[PDB]
């Protein structure tokens, strides 16, 4: 009716305005906008409410007062290195963050789809392969290792990258973060404040040959483990220290007590020397009554 008319025009105008709002809203929502199929108004509204939850919504692994977006920015601002996902089967790089270009000087496009092994130092392909062999991120799924990866523009065609990640699954893959660590030690500990010193553990056969070295050793001495293993500790000691050290060696074989060496110089990979101090003991296997190895805790000295 004529009377009801003006009112039903207010109704149609409010309805059209509302629908246009829902369409705009939908275009702003990633989830909604993506879908090719048209969405129902109530569903666009539900999805928009959930997205809005991730932005301002609404403690397990994050404080209750932070939204998901807040947590994301908080983490990315602190981020370093690059994330990569490699297929365990064939070693194919299924993904890599653009930050990789900063590290290796390769872009995402360069790497995605390639075989990870084409970008490793040949002497590392095997070790990394061992890492990909498979066994809410569980301790057993964790992988962590150094290797040398090819840098685009070069003696500097490789850089030592440490990767920390977990094996993940229809396809099994490694999701990891690779970081390029700075070797040298700036901010040498101040006098006022007792700071924890850097250390690494090595184990040695009776005659001094490296039979084990821990991951921290690559960080400190720049050698990869396979480079030290099977070689004699005496190859690395500075000649002025060889005498003293051999004397501690001979002594440590004669006792079950810990022996602490004097400071000494150790030749790292670039041929320079750092200063270490080691605490040694000959561990005896109580089942065999035989010395299993000399266990050495090596502390970097300022």
């Amino acid at each position: 009716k004529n009377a009801r008319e003006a009112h039903s025009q207010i109704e149609k105008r409010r309805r059209d305005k509302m629908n246009s709002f829902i369409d705009e809203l939908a275009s702003l929502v990633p989830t909604c906008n993506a879908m090719s199929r048209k969405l129902d108004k109530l569903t666009v509204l539900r999805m928009a409410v959930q997205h809005m939850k991730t932005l301002r919504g609404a403690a397990n692994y994050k404080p209750t007062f932070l939204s998901d977006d807040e947590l994301k920015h908080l983490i990315l601002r602190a981020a370093d290195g690059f994330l990569f996902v490699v297929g365990c089967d064939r070693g194919k790089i299924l993904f890599v963050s653009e930050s990789v270009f900063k590290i290796l000087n390769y872009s995402q496009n360069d790497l995605i789809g390639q075989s990870l092994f084409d970008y490793l130092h040949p002497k590392d392909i095997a070790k990394v392969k061992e890492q990909l062999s498979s066994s809410r991120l569980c301790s057993g799924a964790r992988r962590s290792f150094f290797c040398r990866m090819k840098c685009n523009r070069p003696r500097k065609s490789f850089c030592t990258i440490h990767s920390t990640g977990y094996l993940k699954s229809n396809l099994s893959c490694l999701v990891a973060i690779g970081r390029l660590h700075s070797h040298m030690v700036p901010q040498p500990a101040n006098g006022e404040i007792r700071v924890k010193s850097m250390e690494y553990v090595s184990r040695h056969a009776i005659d001094g040959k490296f039979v084990f070295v821990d991951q921290r050793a690559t960080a400190i001495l720049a050698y990869l483990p396979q480079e030290l293993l099977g070689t004699s500790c005496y190859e690395y000691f500075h000649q002025d220290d060889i005498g003293h050290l051999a004397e501690c060696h001979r002594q440590v074989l004669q006792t079950r007590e810990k022996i602490t060496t004097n400071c000494y110089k150790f030749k790292i990979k670039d041929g320079s020397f750092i200063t270490l101090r080691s605490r040694w003991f000959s561990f005896m296997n109580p089942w065999t009554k035989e010395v299993e190895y000399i266990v050495s805790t090596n502390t970097v000295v300022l």
Binding site: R14, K17, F21, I22, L25, L28, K41, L42, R46, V49, M52, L55, R56, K62, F65, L66, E70, K72, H73, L74, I75, L76, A78, D80, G81, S97, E98, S99, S135, R136, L137, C138, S139, G140, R142, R143, S144, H162, T164, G165, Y166, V175, A176, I177, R179, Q187, E192, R194, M198, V201, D214, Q215, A219, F283, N285, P286, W287, T288, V295, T297
Partner: protein
């Protein structure tokens, strides 16, 4: 049916509006939709014009949850989350703090952060915290404003298992922002400057995890059951024939040897708490029950059966 869709619609609109910033709580469907569109839009605009280009960078793969990406990144970065009132009172801290600084979250929460920073560094840090005060428009999220972003370095006391060792510090870097609460606090990712490549796994994610091995009379692995790989990473063939002692933490060797002597003597035993090196280069804390199996006919020792329990850092430290 129209009343049901109208009511569900109203519920959605009211929920949407409740999430809207500002003092005024607008109820008008139209107003709420307008303001929600404005918010999402200012958020795309801001996240596209931010200072840190790292926030726009492609980092996390779609198939990876936020939770897992956060755990992974924090591990890789030797970092934990920390939220402290401008007062200096810690109100939140990530579980990973335990593997990085050897404090339990309960040691930190409801405590002053200054108890963990050398006194010489107190005033400066006080400044950082007290100085910055900002008012945020409803339209623009506080954490998106450059003025609210901040980084600074200082030392933080490490916890310990033995009180004897002298107080020892880690140089760390706070990367965080100021945020308002329903007071004002500073929330940050705290990263250790000294990379930690090998750390202790301080919580048993599973309610309880357990696995079995058998060792020879030389202490070499002879058996590792199907429960072990999801815990320690290694498949049996990777450790079989290798000495158990290769996997123990240096500081535990001595004690473990003593336990084994006791075992050789009595035929049964329980180890002290000790650390075992997983394939992924984490120390997990274990406690092991042992017994020697003897040959059915000649009665000589044949092998040792070991039942390994994974234990939390809280239990190890408690005693």
């Amino acid at each position: 049916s129209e009343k049901k869709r109208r009511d569900q619609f109203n519920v959605l609109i009211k929920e949407l509006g409740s999430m809207l910033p500002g003092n005024a709580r607008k109820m008008d469907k139209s107003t709420v939709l307008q303001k929600s569109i404005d918010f999402l839009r200012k958020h795309k605009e801001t996240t596209a014009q931010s200072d840190a280009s790292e926030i726009r960078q492609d980092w996390k793969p779609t198939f990876l949850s936020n939770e897992e990406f956060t755990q992974l990144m924090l591990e890789a970065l030797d970092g934990f989350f920390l939220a402290i009132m401008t007062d200096g009172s810690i109100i939140y801290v990530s579980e990973s703090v335990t593997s990085l600084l050897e404090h339990l979250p309960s040691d930190l929460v409801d405590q002053s952060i200054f108890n963990f920073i050398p006194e010489g560094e107190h005033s400066e840090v006080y400044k950082i915290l007290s100085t910055h005060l900002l008012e945020s428009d409803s339209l623009t999220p506080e954490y998106l404003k450059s003025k609210n972003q901040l980084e600074f370095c200082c030392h933080m006391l490490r916890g310990t298992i033995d009180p004897k060792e002298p107080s020892t510090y880690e140089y760390v870097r706070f990367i965080g922002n100021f945020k308002s609460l329903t007071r004002v606090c500073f929330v940050a990712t705290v990263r250790l400057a000294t990379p930690q490549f090998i750390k202790e796994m301080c919580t048993v994610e599973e309610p309880n995890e357990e696995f079995t091995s058998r060792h020879s009379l030389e202490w070499k692995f002879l058996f590792l059951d199907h429960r072990a790989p999801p815990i320690i990473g290694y498949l049996p063939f990777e450790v079989l024939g290798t000495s158990g002692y290769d996997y123990y933490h240096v500081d535990d060797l001595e004690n473990l040897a003593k336990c084994h002597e006791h075992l050789m003597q009595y035929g049964k035993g329980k180890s002290c708490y000790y650390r075992f090196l997983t394939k992924g280069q984490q120390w997990i804390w274990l406690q092991t029950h042992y017994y020697i199996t003897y040959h059915q006919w000649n009665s000589r020792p044949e092998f040792i059966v070991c039942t390994h329990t994974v234990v939390s850092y809280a239990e190890v430290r408690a005693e």
